[PDB]
From a paper:
We explored this idea using the model virus Turnip Yellow Mosaic Virus ([name]), which encodes a vDUB known as [name] that suppresses Ub-dependent antiviral responses and is vital to virus replication as a protease that processes the viral polyprotein. The tightest binding UbV ([name]) was chosen for further study and was found to block both polyprotein cleavage and DUB activity of [name] in vitro. X-ray structures of [name] in isolation and bound to [name] reveal that the inhibitor exists as a dimer that binds two copies of [name]. [name] blocked polyprotein cleavage activity that is essential for [name] replication, and also, DUB activity that usurps cellular Ub-dependent antiviral mechanisms.
Residue numbers in the entry:
A (entry chain B): 0 to 73
B (entry chain A): 0 to 74
The structure:
């Protein structure tokens, strides 16, 4: 009869299957396919560095189960 | 070739279809069905009150599109 919302404290992770040769831009494209956030609204942070679109995951020592941080850019 | 995880700042809401006569116990059961969180691990908080299992949504004047807060209750 009525809709209510329950705000949860749960943290969302985007889980992606990637190759070490994938560029940061390719990862942003995958995030866009999953979430509809354009690449230019995405900052990907790893180990205190904003990752550059043209570099690869392997360049940054990103390994299996590494956690990146997505921060939106308005 | 490998799994990676991208942590996001996005807030998750559980959307429930409920009746004013539903008890808080009924609401917690619905959350369990959707998310596998047992009722004893759920605190539901609204308007500065922890909602009691035996009382109804109507008892709390919870209306359409009210945003309850789920706070996990663990030992």
């Amino acid at each position: 009869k009525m809709q209510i919302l329950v705000r949860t404290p749960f943290v969302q992770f985007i889980t992606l299957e990637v190759e070490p040769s994938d560029t940061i831009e390719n990862v942003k494209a995958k995030i866009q396919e999953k979430e509809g956030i354009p690449p230019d609204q995405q900052r990907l942070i790893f180990a205190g560095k904003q990752l550059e679109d043209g570099r690869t995951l392997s360049d940054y020592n990103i390994q299996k189960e590494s956690t990146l941080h997505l921060v939106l850019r308005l």
